[PDB]
Amino acid sequence: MHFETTKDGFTIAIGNRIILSHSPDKPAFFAGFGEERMDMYRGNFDIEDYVIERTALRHAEVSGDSVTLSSAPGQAPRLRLTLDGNAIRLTALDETINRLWLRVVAETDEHVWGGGEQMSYFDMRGRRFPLWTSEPGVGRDKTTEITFKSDVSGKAGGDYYNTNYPQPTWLSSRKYALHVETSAYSVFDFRNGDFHEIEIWAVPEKIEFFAGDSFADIVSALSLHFGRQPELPDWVYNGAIIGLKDGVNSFARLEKIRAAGTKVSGLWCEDWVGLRQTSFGARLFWDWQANDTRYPHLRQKIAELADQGIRFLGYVNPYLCVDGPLFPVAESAGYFATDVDGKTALVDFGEFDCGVVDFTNPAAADWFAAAIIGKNMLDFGLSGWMADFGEYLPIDIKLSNGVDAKLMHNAWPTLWAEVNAKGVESRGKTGEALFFMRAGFTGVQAHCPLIWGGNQSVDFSRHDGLVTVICGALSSGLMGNAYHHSDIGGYTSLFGNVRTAELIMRWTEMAAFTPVMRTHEGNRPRDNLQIDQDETVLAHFARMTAIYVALAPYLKSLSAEAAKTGLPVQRPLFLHYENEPQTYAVQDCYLYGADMLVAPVWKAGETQRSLYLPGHGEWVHLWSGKRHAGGRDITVETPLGEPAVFYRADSSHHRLFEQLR
Template sequence: MQLDLIPGGFILSIDGREILRHTEAAPALFVGHGEERMDMYRGNFEIEDYVVERTALTSVEISGNRIEFAVARWLPARFALTIKGNHVLTESLDASINRVWIRIAAEADEHVWGGGEQMSYFDMRGRKFPLWTSEPGVGRDKTTEITFKSDVTGKAGGDYYNTNYPQPTYISSRKYALHVETTAYSVFDFRRDGFHEIEVWAVPQRLEFFAASTFADLVGQLSLRFGRQPELPEWVYGGAILGLKDGENSFTRMQKMRDAGVKVSGLWCEDWVGLRHTSFGARLFWDWQANESRYPKLKEKIAALNAEGIRFLGYVNPYLCVDGPLFPIADAKGYFAKDEQGKTALVDFGEFDCGVVDFTNPQSADWFAEEVIGKNMLDYGLSGWMADFGEYLPIDVKLANGIDAKLMHNAWPTLWAKVNAKAVESRGKTGDALFFMRAGFTGVQAYCPLLWGGDQSVDFTRHDGLVTVICGALSSGLLGNAYHHSDIGGYTSLFGNVRTPELIMRWAEMAAFTAVMRSHEGNRPRDNLQIDQDPQVLTHFARMTAIYVHLAPYLKSLSAEAAKTGLPVQRPLFLHHEDDRDTYAIQDAYLYGRDLLVAPVWQAAETTRTIYLPKGESWVHVWTGEAHAGGETATIPAPLGQPAVFYRKGTSYQALFDGLRDL
């Protein structure tokens, strides 16, 4: 980084890109004090701030690589920045400061991506994004009826910025990236032409800057910084992971689907721990051990599946229900977070209460990794699981490490991922056992081998339906998360909103061109169509699994590339076409590796797909073999079973891709 003095201030640059420009007339730094109000209701938050003070620090004193800021030259400095390599270390010189605003230099035509896993807007420019892990909300669009009803009944409607996985990191079209090292609530505001404003409700540890000559190199740098995932397990390439929660009948239904031609790599039964019934629907019994009343002789059946090349997966989260046998064990050992009175804190998860296992206590984390995941799951025979939640840490509990829960809340998903990864590593299963998470924050990449997109509604809606999964994959992929997938058919069914055959089929078409295919029965299985209940849907799904298996050699190459370079499996078009700015805002299509361009149909009753094809290539439509010139917008027939997919002419995988027409 380079620091240059200018009249009344300075310019800080990285590789020739201006990052900070400060003058007395246009200061780059503001500090102050705020009094926040945070209310949590079942993972949904109401957050507001009363800003007591926001003061521009206009005067600077520069000594070597240290910059001290004051309100005026004759007043004492209140804040300092120290440049160390490509990092800017921050230091408060005033104990009253708990709010910091930093303005990063911007250009009017700049694009910005990242922010963790963003579900509504891939290009973040022009909008404001609070970064706080939470339930994403149902509907996520304040103009819709389902969002209104969700807000009224459970404060659960959400908005465009709500996400299970926020991260204070972004990539700029100027080919630099910024990461803010903090776990505090923060806000990235990209609404101004001349600057981006970063707001943090604490003094951040530092700002980290990265720069590169290509977007691919920049993504590689970020993946090294945050961690890279191992290659996908070999068993995954065998087909779809079938999500069934029907007790012993799950095995019968799986066989019926196999007999219909469905390629199966795994059977995922969330209800392996048993069920409880609530007004939301059938919920799992949150005590993490096999329920052999619901699944008789499960261990033997898992062994039999393994012999056929099919793995069994389950479910776990970081809470223990008060009416389960594990709760009193953990409670007696003091492994739960505490309330204000020093007693075990209990959280209402919707008609049942749970304790929060305190992962800031090393003994608690080790116990959960060894006794719960290690012995009850891995030793029992499970090859994977949904590692759910992580975004629910209450902000009023007392933790073993003594840090305010408001500062640990965002960090919690990463601690949860670390517990799962430690259990897997302890059994020598890294790269074979596959757990997947929806919650995340900085550093989750180093522990979690696979993201899933969370709980989309069972519909085609713009802010909570099928299309949001693409946005989530692209935004998180730029920050080092190589593998992303989703619940085929969506999950959340409320207020009469149910799946259609078309939705399941369109979702399966997209999933065939992602790292992992996995189905889900949803929160209300009996109210919603299931894959094995409709002959047309079942036949279509079988063909999509055949496509996924057919593409396994290509996906394996992408997995190896991800482990080596950090490039994600699903990529924004601009990642390999950075000179074509028409690709910068596209969020409803993606590159599957470098050589395939996938544009899923994401709106109901659509039988064509209009897509922009990047310049500099000739693109071949997979289903017809027809070539299209790059730099053009094409409208392509996309009937059920033929999503708009193109390959790059000249690819070494042409024969493999042409073989899709025979399936």
Template sequence: MKIQTTSNGFDLVLDGRLILRHRSDAPCLFVGQGDARMHMYRGNFDIEDYVIERTPLAHAVVSGSVIAFSAAPGQPVRLTLQMSGDEHNGAIAFRADDAAINRLWVRIAAEQGEHVWGGGEQMSYFDMRGRRFPLWTSEPGVGRDKTTEITFKADVTGKSGGDYWNTNYPQPTYLSSRRYALHVETTSYSAFDFRRDDFHEIEVWAVPDRIELTARPTFIALVEVMSERFGRQPTLPEWVYGGAIIGLKDGANSFERLERIIAAGTKVSGVWCEDWVGLRHTSFGARLFWDWKANDDRYPALRQRIAELEDRGIRFLGYVNPYLAVDGSLFPEAEAAGYFATDESGKTALVDFGEFDCGVVDFTNPEAAAWFAERVIGQNMIDYGLSGWMADFGEYLPIDVKLANDVDAKVMHNAWPTLWAEVNARAVESRGRTGEILFFMRAGFTGVQKHCPLLWAGDQSVDFTRHDGLVTVISGALSSGLLGNAYHHSDIGGYTSLFGNVRTAELIMRWAEMGAFTPVMRTHEGNRPRDNLQIDQDPQVLAHFARMTRVYVHLVPYLKALVEEASTQGLPVQRPLFLHFEGDARTYAIQDAYLYGADLLVAPVSQAGRTEWSTYLPAGADWVHVWTNETFAGGSDVTVPVPFGQPPVFYRAGTRFAALFAGLRTL
């Protein structure tokens, strides 16, 4: 990384790429002060900033690798930057010489036509260029489109409508089509603004520790570096390859329903009963009882059932989150030990999670984190026989609680998902079962990759909508995958059913078709199971689902090869088209199709009522339509018939897996 000085400023260049351009009449840095208003309501946030000061630091003095910034010559230095690195990697360390600074804006040089991706898990827009993205972990919202009725109703009833940028998993990291990556090391509220042609503006509500930069000649090399930086995940457990994980929350009746699903020819690797802890009923629907141990009334003799299932090669999975209900058995135990976050008066902080209150286990307290990992997850879950679980609600840290490490909860809020992932991973590791137990999370932030073995896409609506339906899962997989998250999946059929919005048979079938071409297939009954169609309630849906599980299992040899690539190179299983077709600029903005590894292209049907589907096939290869064996030239738009059970899938001509892929036609 080089600093090239000019008569009135400097350029910062990394491997031939202009990163910062500073001139006295066009500064790259602004500092100041802001007074933020933040309000949290059940995981949804209303955030507004009153900017008291935003001052351009027009004067820069370069001394070797150090740059001192002030507003004008002769005025005090307000911010100092320390540059370090080599030709391909660089870091910009920040030091505030003015303690009053709590806002920073830095402008990164941009080019017209440049594309940017990342930002954690972005659900609405894969290519982030042209929009501003606040980076704050929260509920993603219902509808996520302010022009729709469902979003309006969600906003009115629970402040939960959301917008395009709301996400469970933000991360202040992006990759550019100029083949460099940028990461901001901070947990404070921040935002990426990509709306200008000549610069990207990064906003941080603090002085960040540093900005990290990496340049590589190819996108694959960049992704490999990202996975090394944030930590590679363990391989998928061997048992997952046996088929789908069936989500049932019907008490003891779940096992009878499982048998009917298996009898229909479904390949099953696990049964996931999130209600293993019991239920409570609220206006939102049936909610779990947040006291993390088996409920014998709802699941009699569960331990024996788990052992019997495992003998048949079927694992049992449950559910947990980092909060404890006040009316549960674990709450008094944790409170007596002082393991909860507290309020202003020093008492246990209670949070309303929707008609019931909970305490927040304080993971900044090492003893509390160790207690939860051992007492709750280790003893009550792993030792009981669970082979996995949904680790939910990492984005819910209230912003007004007091924590053991004395760091402001507003600063710890984004860090919370990573701490939560670490607690889960610690429990698994304590039993020597890393790579065998599978827990999955929707919340994330920088570093979650190292601890969480599998992402899930959160709570999509049970529909085909542009900002909250099936298609958003693809964008989420692609954006998070570029940052080291190799494994991603979603609730087949969606989750959120509100305001009369319910599943159709078509939605479940199209979602299952996509799920067969992801690392893990898993169903969910949704927040209102009785109102929504389930896979075992319609013979056509069940037969279709069973067939798609056979497709998934048929592809296991290929999936295992992709898992090996994830382990050795950090490449995600689901990949943007440009990752292997850099020379084809049309691939840079595609977000409704993906490469499943290097050799399969999947373009899921993501709209209702379609009998044909069009997609783009990248230039540089010929492509074979899996179901008809017809070959298409790359660099062209194609349209194919899409009867149920034959999603738009193409394989690269000449691949060593051609025989395996061709075998899909016989299933």
């Protein structure tokens, strides 16, 4: 990075690219003080700042590699910048600053991607994105009835920026990435043509920069910095993970699914710990051991399924319910986050109370890894699980390490990911055991082998349906999470919103061209269509699993590529077509590796799909063999069973693709 003087002040650049521009009249930094409200209701945050001071740091004193910044000439310095390689280090000289604003130079036509896993907008330009892990919202669009009803009944509607996995990292179309090293609340403000504004409710230790001649190279460098995932385990390629939460009846339903020719890698029973009925629906009993009442011979059933080549997966989250036998064990060992009066802090998760296992206490972290992940899950015979939640830390609780909950809230998913990874490592099962997370922050990449898109509504809505999965895959992919998947058919059934046959089949069509096909009965299983309950849906499902298994050699090559280069399995078109401006904001299509293009149908009643075909080569339609020229919009027939999928005519895997026809 190059410091350079100008007429009125200075610039900081990486290569040809000016990043920071300071002058008294156009300052780069503003500093001040706020009093926030962050009220939590069931993982939804009502956040409002009261800004008491915001003051431009107009005056810069340069002393070599250090810049000292003050409000005005003669006034006491408030902030120090140090250029240290690819990083701007920041030191608060005024202890009272808890609000910092930083402007980075922007061009009018610049795109910015990342922000963690964004569900609504892939290109974030033109909008503001707070970065605070939470419930992402049901509906997530104030103009829909579902969002309105979620807001009225539970403050649960959310909005376009809410995510289980925020990250204060962006990739710019100017070919640099920026990372802020903080766990504090922060906002990316992309509303202004001439600058991006970062708000941080802290002075971060540093801001780190990555540059390169291609987007691919910057993503490689980001994945190396956050850490890469192991290759997918070989057993995943055997077919779909069937999600059932029907107790002993799960096994009879698995048999019916297999009898239709379905390729099955795994049975995933999140109710392995038993059910809890609430007004939300069929929830789980949060006590992390096999429930002999619900699954009386589970250890034997796991060994029986293993002899048929089918793994078994469960469910765990980092909270313990008050009415479970593990709660008093953990409370006696002092493993819970505490309230102001030193008592176990109880959080309302929705008509039941749970303690938060305090992962800042190393003994609590070690216990959860060894006793629950190790003994109760891996030694019991689980090959994997949903590793759920991580986003419910309220800011009014006290943690063993003495760090404010305001700073630990965003750190929680990364701590939770590490507990899972340590338990896996302790059994030598890294790269074989498959846990998947919906929550995240900086560093989850190093610990979690597979992200899932959390809870979608059971619909085709713009802001909470099928299409939001693709946005989540593309964003989280640029942040160095190579492997993304979703619940086939979505999760959230509320206010009479229920699945259709068409929704399940369209969702299956996308999932077959992702790393993992997994189903989910959802929050209200008996109110919603399941893959086994309609002959047409089941036959469609079986066929798509056969297509997934036939594509295994191609997916295995993409997983190898992800381990060697960091590039995600689901790629935005601009990553391989930099000179084509039409590819830069596309968020409902992805490149499945370099060689396939996928354009999922995300609306009810569509028989056709229009998409931009990139490049100067030919693309082959997977189902017909018909060739199409790159560099134009095209329309193809997409009846049920035949998603808009194309491969490069020059693909080394052409013989494999020709077979899936």
